[PDB]
Protein backbone atom coordinates (compact mmCIF):
# COMPACT_ATOMS: atom_id res chain seq x y z
CA UNK A 200 0.00 0.00 0.00
CA UNK A 201 -0.68 2.05 -1.73
CA UNK A 202 1.10 0.44 -4.68
CA UNK A 203 4.73 -0.66 -4.76
CA UNK A 204 7.29 -1.52 -7.42
CA UNK A 205 10.76 -2.96 -7.84
CA UNK A 206 13.04 -3.47 -10.82
CA UNK A 207 15.23 -6.32 -12.05
CA UNK A 208 17.82 -5.76 -14.73
CA UNK A 209 17.99 -8.63 -17.23
CA UNK A 210 20.73 -7.59 -19.67
CA UNK A 211 24.02 -5.76 -19.91
CA UNK A 212 25.49 -3.58 -22.64
CA UNK A 213 27.10 -6.31 -24.73
CA UNK A 214 24.05 -8.56 -24.62
CA UNK A 215 21.80 -5.62 -25.47
CA UNK A 216 23.98 -4.70 -28.43
CA UNK A 217 24.01 -8.27 -29.69
CA UNK A 218 20.30 -8.82 -29.09
CA UNK A 219 19.78 -5.57 -30.92
CA UNK A 220 21.50 -7.00 -34.04
CA UNK A 221 20.15 -10.53 -34.02
CA UNK A 222 16.60 -9.48 -33.17
CA UNK A 223 16.42 -12.70 -31.19
CA UNK A 224 15.69 -12.57 -27.46
CA UNK A 225 15.48 -15.90 -25.63
CA UNK A 226 15.18 -14.53 -22.07
CA UNK A 227 11.91 -15.06 -20.22
CA UNK A 228 9.80 -11.93 -19.94
CA UNK A 229 8.09 -11.09 -16.66
CA UNK A 230 6.53 -8.01 -15.08
CA UNK A 231 3.98 -5.41 -16.14
CA UNK A 232 6.47 -2.80 -17.32
CA UNK A 233 9.46 -3.51 -19.54
CA UNK A 234 12.68 -1.59 -19.55
CA UNK A 235 13.63 -1.10 -23.18
CA UNK A 236 16.86 -0.11 -24.86
CA UNK A 237 18.07 0.90 -28.30
CA UNK A 238 21.71 1.80 -29.02
CA UNK A 239 21.01 5.48 -28.35
CA UNK A 240 18.35 5.48 -25.65
CA UNK A 241 16.40 3.85 -22.86
CA UNK A 242 12.75 4.10 -21.90
CA UNK A 243 9.80 1.98 -20.81
CA UNK A 244 6.81 0.09 -22.15
CA UNK A 245 3.58 -1.07 -20.55
CA UNK A 246 1.63 -4.17 -21.49
CA UNK A 247 -2.06 -3.55 -21.55
CA UNK A 248 -4.42 -6.17 -22.96
CA UNK A 249 -1.88 -8.18 -24.92
CA UNK A 250 0.01 -5.26 -26.47
CA UNK A 251 3.28 -3.74 -25.23
CA UNK A 252 2.93 0.00 -25.66
CA UNK A 253 5.68 2.58 -25.73
CA UNK A 254 6.45 5.95 -27.27
CA UNK A 255 7.33 6.55 -30.88
CA UNK A 256 10.02 9.05 -29.87
CA UNK A 257 11.75 6.17 -28.10
CA UNK A 258 10.99 3.22 -30.37
CA UNK A 259 10.74 4.82 -33.81
CA UNK A 260 9.70 2.20 -36.37
CA UNK A 261 11.88 -0.46 -34.78
CA UNK A 262 10.99 -4.08 -34.16
CA UNK A 263 11.29 -5.64 -30.73
CA UNK A 264 13.73 -8.53 -30.18
CA UNK A 265 11.79 -11.72 -29.46
CA UNK A 266 12.13 -15.50 -29.01
CA UNK A 267 11.24 -16.19 -32.66
CA UNK A 268 13.15 -13.19 -34.00
CA UNK A 269 12.19 -9.51 -34.33
CA UNK A 270 8.55 -8.59 -33.68
CA UNK A 271 6.97 -6.09 -36.09
CA UNK A 272 4.98 -3.24 -34.53
CA UNK A 273 1.26 -4.03 -34.60
CA UNK A 274 0.25 -0.40 -34.04
CA UNK A 275 2.15 2.72 -35.08
CA UNK A 276 0.71 6.14 -34.38
CA UNK A 277 3.23 8.91 -34.90
CA UNK A 278 1.06 11.92 -34.16
CA UNK A 279 0.13 10.57 -30.76
CA UNK A 280 3.70 9.31 -30.16
CA UNK A 281 2.44 5.76 -29.67
CA UNK A 282 3.61 2.39 -30.94
CA UNK A 283 2.89 -1.17 -29.88
CA UNK A 284 3.97 -4.77 -30.40
CA UNK A 285 2.10 -7.89 -29.42
CA UNK A 286 3.27 -8.56 -25.86
CA UNK A 287 5.88 -11.27 -25.62
CA UNK A 288 4.70 -14.39 -23.75
CA UNK A 289 5.25 -13.96 -20.02
CA UNK A 290 4.71 -10.22 -19.70
CA UNK A 291 2.00 -9.49 -17.12
CA UNK A 292 -0.70 -7.63 -19.06
CA UNK A 293 -2.46 -4.91 -17.07
CA UNK A 294 -6.05 -3.76 -17.37
CA UNK A 295 -7.43 -0.33 -18.28
CA UNK A 296 -8.86 1.81 -15.55
CA UNK A 297 -12.51 2.50 -16.36
CA UNK A 298 -13.47 3.55 -12.81
CA UNK A 299 -12.73 7.21 -13.52
CA UNK A 300 -10.47 8.05 -10.57
CA UNK A 301 -8.48 11.31 -10.76
CA UNK A 302 -5.93 10.07 -8.19
CA UNK A 303 -3.12 8.54 -10.19
CA UNK A 304 0.40 7.23 -9.79
CA UNK A 305 3.27 7.38 -12.22
CA UNK A 306 5.70 4.49 -12.25
CA UNK A 307 9.26 5.62 -13.03
CA UNK A 308 12.04 3.50 -14.56
CA UNK A 309 13.55 3.64 -11.05
CA UNK A 310 10.55 1.68 -9.78
CA UNK A 311 9.21 4.59 -7.78
CA UNK A 312 5.46 4.96 -7.62
CA UNK A 313 4.75 8.69 -7.56
CA UNK A 314 1.39 10.49 -6.92
CA UNK A 315 -0.26 12.35 -9.79
CA UNK A 316 -3.52 14.32 -9.88
CA UNK A 317 -5.30 13.92 -13.19
CA UNK A 318 -6.01 17.37 -14.69
CA UNK A 319 -7.56 16.25 -18.00
CA UNK A 320 -7.69 13.44 -20.56
CA UNK A 321 -3.95 13.45 -21.26
CA UNK A 322 -2.51 15.49 -18.39
CA UNK A 323 -1.70 15.27 -14.68
CA UNK A 324 0.18 17.28 -12.09
CA UNK A 325 3.00 15.92 -9.98
CA UNK A 326 1.80 16.53 -6.44
CA UNK A 327 5.49 16.86 -5.53
CA UNK A 328 7.72 18.33 -8.25
CA UNK A 329 10.79 16.33 -9.30
CA UNK A 330 13.93 17.22 -11.26
CA UNK A 331 13.61 16.70 -15.01
CA UNK A 332 16.64 14.44 -14.64
CA UNK A 333 14.61 12.16 -12.42
CA UNK A 334 11.86 11.55 -15.03
CA UNK A 335 14.15 11.12 -18.07
CA UNK A 336 13.96 7.58 -19.47
CA UNK A 337 10.51 6.87 -17.95
CA UNK A 338 8.41 7.51 -21.07
CA UNK A 339 6.13 4.55 -21.78
CA UNK A 340 5.93 4.08 -18.04
CA UNK A 341 2.39 3.48 -16.76
CA UNK A 342 0.06 5.88 -15.02
CA UNK A 343 -2.11 3.96 -12.59
CA UNK A 344 -5.39 4.14 -10.69
CA UNK A 345 -5.29 3.28 -6.96
CA UNK A 346 -6.65 -0.15 -7.84
CA UNK A 347 -3.58 -0.60 -10.01
CA UNK A 348 -5.38 -0.38 -13.33
CA UNK A 349 -3.70 1.51 -16.16
CA UNK A 350 -4.79 5.03 -17.10
CA UNK A 351 -2.27 5.48 -19.93
CA UNK A 352 1.44 5.88 -20.58
CA UNK A 353 3.94 8.60 -19.72
CA UNK A 354 4.69 10.73 -22.79
CA UNK A 355 6.18 14.13 -21.88
CA UNK A 356 7.02 16.36 -18.92
CA UNK A 357 5.96 19.94 -18.36
CA UNK A 358 9.04 21.59 -16.95
CA UNK A 359 10.73 24.89 -16.15
CA UNK A 360 14.36 25.29 -15.02
CA UNK A 361 14.88 21.52 -14.89
CA UNK A 362 11.88 21.12 -12.60
CA UNK A 363 8.79 19.16 -13.62
CA UNK A 364 5.39 20.20 -12.23
CA UNK A 365 3.25 17.93 -14.41
CA UNK A 366 3.09 15.21 -17.06
CA UNK A 367 1.44 14.47 -20.38
CA UNK A 368 0.34 10.92 -20.98
CA UNK A 369 -1.31 8.83 -23.68
CA UNK A 370 -4.73 7.62 -22.37
CA UNK A 371 -5.79 3.99 -22.73
CA UNK A 372 -8.49 5.64 -24.87
CA UNK A 373 -5.92 6.65 -27.48
CA UNK A 374 -4.65 3.07 -27.44
CA UNK A 375 -8.13 1.76 -28.19
CA UNK A 376 -8.74 4.35 -30.91
CA UNK A 377 -5.46 3.28 -32.56
CA UNK A 378 -6.52 -0.37 -32.47
CA UNK A 379 -10.02 0.22 -33.85
CA UNK A 380 -8.44 2.40 -36.55
CA UNK A 381 -5.81 -0.16 -37.65
CA UNK B 382 19.34 0.88 -36.36
CA UNK B 383 18.56 -2.52 -34.84
CA UNK B 384 15.79 -3.91 -32.62
CA UNK B 385 14.51 -2.43 -29.41
CA UNK B 386 15.71 -4.76 -26.64
CA UNK B 387 14.20 -5.57 -23.24
CA UNK B 388 17.04 -4.98 -20.78
CA UNK B 389 15.05 -5.21 -17.54
CA UNK B 390 11.54 -5.15 -16.12
CA UNK B 391 9.48 -3.73 -13.28
CA UNK B 392 7.16 -5.72 -11.05
CA UNK B 393 4.07 -4.06 -9.58
CA UNK B 394 2.50 -4.90 -6.24
Ligand SMILES: COc1ccc2c(O[C@@H]3C[C@H]4C(=O)N[C@]5(C(=O)NS(=O)(=O)C6(C)CC6)C[C@H]5CC/C=C/C/C=C/[C@H](NC(=O)c5ccn(C)n5)C(=O)N4C3)cc(OC(C)C)nc2c1C
Nearest residue numbers: 240242256257278279280334335336337338354355356357
Ligand atom coordinates in the same frame (compact mmCIF):
# COMPACT_ATOMS: atom_id res chain seq x y z
C1 LIG C 1 2.54 13.90 -29.50
O1 LIG C 1 3.61 13.33 -30.21
C2 LIG C 1 4.95 13.61 -29.82
C3 LIG C 1 5.12 14.34 -28.65
C4 LIG C 1 6.39 14.67 -28.18
C5 LIG C 1 7.51 14.22 -28.93
C6 LIG C 1 8.82 14.56 -28.45
O2 LIG C 1 8.91 15.31 -27.26
C7 LIG C 1 10.20 15.20 -26.72
C8 LIG C 1 10.35 13.91 -26.02
C9 LIG C 1 9.61 14.11 -24.73
C10 LIG C 1 10.20 13.43 -23.57
O3 LIG C 1 11.37 13.58 -23.29
N1 LIG C 1 9.39 12.60 -22.66
C11 LIG C 1 10.07 12.05 -21.49
C12 LIG C 1 11.15 10.97 -21.55
O4 LIG C 1 11.60 10.41 -20.55
N2 LIG C 1 11.67 10.58 -22.84
S1 LIG C 1 12.85 9.43 -22.82
O5 LIG C 1 12.41 8.17 -22.28
O6 LIG C 1 13.91 9.80 -21.89
C13 LIG C 1 13.51 9.23 -24.52
C14 LIG C 1 13.84 10.53 -25.16
C15 LIG C 1 14.23 7.98 -24.90
C16 LIG C 1 12.78 8.14 -25.25
C17 LIG C 1 9.09 11.75 -20.42
C18 LIG C 1 9.97 12.95 -20.30
C19 LIG C 1 11.04 12.76 -19.32
C20 LIG C 1 11.85 13.84 -19.01
C21 LIG C 1 11.66 15.19 -19.74
C22 LIG C 1 12.89 15.92 -20.18
C23 LIG C 1 12.74 17.34 -20.73
C24 LIG C 1 12.00 17.53 -22.06
C25 LIG C 1 10.60 18.05 -21.95
C26 LIG C 1 9.63 17.70 -23.08
N3 LIG C 1 8.35 18.31 -22.82
C27 LIG C 1 7.39 18.49 -23.85
O7 LIG C 1 7.63 18.13 -24.97
C28 LIG C 1 6.07 19.13 -23.54
C29 LIG C 1 5.83 20.06 -22.53
C30 LIG C 1 4.49 20.40 -22.59
N4 LIG C 1 3.92 19.70 -23.59
C31 LIG C 1 2.52 19.75 -23.98
N5 LIG C 1 4.88 18.91 -24.18
C32 LIG C 1 9.44 16.21 -23.23
O8 LIG C 1 9.01 15.51 -22.30
N6 LIG C 1 9.74 15.55 -24.49
C33 LIG C 1 10.27 16.21 -25.69
C34 LIG C 1 9.96 14.13 -29.20
C35 LIG C 1 9.75 13.38 -30.37
O9 LIG C 1 10.92 12.97 -31.08
C36 LIG C 1 10.98 12.11 -32.20
C37 LIG C 1 9.67 11.77 -32.87
C38 LIG C 1 12.08 12.57 -33.20
N7 LIG C 1 8.50 13.09 -30.80
C39 LIG C 1 7.36 13.50 -30.07
C40 LIG C 1 6.05 13.18 -30.55
C41 LIG C 1 5.94 12.40 -31.79
Ligand code: NA
Nearest residue numbers: 204310311312
Ligand atom coordinates in the same frame (compact mmCIF):
# COMPACT_ATOMS: atom_id res chain seq x y z
NA1 NA D 1 10.31 1.67 -5.12
